[PDB]
Nucleic acid binder design. Structure first.
Ligand code: K
Ligand code: K
Ligand code: MN
Ligand code: MN
Ligand code: MN
Ligand code: MN
Length: 135
RNA sequence: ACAU
DNA sequence: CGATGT
């Protein structure tokens, strides 16, 4: 119903899908950018949405913050819940970096605990997530 | 269909 | 119009 303003919002941006992928996390209340990942030459939207949530979990855990995370990706929220990113992206030499990062994110989820609620940003009611790339 |  | 996903 209502936005939980005391939260972290994350999103992917890309040039092509598959294509160059980046992501960032912002304070939902203020829009302040709290982290941004350097562009990865080839990935998918969903891989980037997944990495963004996992990075958010790690960022909040390191700072002892109980804030929830908002994501607009139904897929990535499920992959994080499952601790398994079921991407269709070919594993080859050009996708090795994104796949390394995804594998390492899964590995982190399988070796750490968190209570962080991972919440669906309701774009249909609230507009674009505050971490959106405006593109 | 829904979500990107 | 193309794509990634449940
Ligand atoms: K969206
Ligand atoms: K589809
Ligand atoms: Mn998104
Ligand atoms: Mn894996
Ligand atoms: Mn977006
Ligand atoms: Mn967009």
């Amino acid at each position: 119903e209502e936005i939980i303003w005391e939260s972290l919002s994350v999103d992917v941006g890309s040039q092509g899908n598959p294509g160059i992928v980046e992501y960032k996390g912002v304070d939902t209340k203020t829009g302040e950018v709290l982290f941004e990942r350097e562009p990865i030459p080839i990935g998918t939207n969903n891989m980037g949405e997944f990495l963004a949530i996992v990075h958010g979990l790690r960022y909040l855990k390191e700072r002892n913050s109980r804030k929830p995370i908002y994501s607009d990706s139904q897929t990535a929220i499920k992959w994080v819940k499952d601790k398994k990113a079921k991407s269709t992206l070919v594993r080859n030499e050009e996708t090795a970096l994104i796949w390394k990062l995804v594998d390492e994110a899964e590995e982190w989820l399988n070796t750490h605990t968190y209570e962080t609620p991972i919440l669906k940003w309701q774009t249909d009611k609230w507009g674009a997530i505050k971490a959106d790339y405006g593109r």
